[PDB]
Amino acid sequence: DIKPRIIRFGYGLADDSPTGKASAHFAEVVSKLSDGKMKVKTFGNGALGPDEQLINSLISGSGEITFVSTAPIASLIPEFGVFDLPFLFDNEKVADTVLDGPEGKKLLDKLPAKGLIGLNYWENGFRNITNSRHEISKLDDIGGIKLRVMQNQVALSVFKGLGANAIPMPFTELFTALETKTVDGQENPLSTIQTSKFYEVQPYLTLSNHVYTPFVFLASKKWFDQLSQDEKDVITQAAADSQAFQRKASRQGNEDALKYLKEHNVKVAEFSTEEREKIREKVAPIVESLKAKIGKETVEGVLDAAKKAS
């Protein structure tokens, strides 16, 4: 019980990013599972606007499918702000376990009230600081840096707390802000830094891995609800296939991105053990302060699930 249908899937990252390629994989599996009747059309590189517009497109129904970072969802469902807290997850295995577990599900379950279906979580990843003013090797080096952040009170508060001038901006305006030096820097996973070419305008990279961002793989509830059960199954089955593909592609892409950026002679720094503990001490107080704007129960439940998986 599948009728011919065309499905639009916009997103912000470049087409050849790992998640870009995972979106093409989703389209192929949807085709395969529906004998070519359900055709997904991918619009990468922000062609359908940034996360915030994609989100609104799905709620209204001009778009069907997207993936977005959790941070712009905090603007709808504040509990999603939890993932902008630094150092939540020690590694990708913990993140997978927590996100695929009850604490991840509790958050996804809040989406239908806002007109969205959270099909599952994909991996954006560990974020790393890039900038064009000077090497960042010490907490103090962040002082006064004009750093773009995702558009969220948690992201803004965290980096202001670390001494930056935190400048919320949509991802889709970021390359130009970096190139014109309207902003000194940004922070994102390595494969994004690479595939969106931020290295061409960011001579300095710090391997800080300070925050882990999930993507949410989203469907418009208005559109999803009008589908037949056989059609919903194609989408959810393809979503499960594509999550596994995405996460594997993301992790390989991280390894490849690091190699490329080093071989291309980007200047790479890290936070020493001493600097890392200075970071944590600065971080504790308004992590504590920010629980009230996220949701105490979400924060404590995520932190507990992460301990149990680690």
Ligand SMILES: O=C(O)[C@H](O)[C@@H](O)[C@H](O)[C@H](O)CO
């Ligand atoms: O810096 C950001 O805002 C995110 O890290 C990007 O991954 C966006 O979510 C993009 O729109 C996803 O395609």
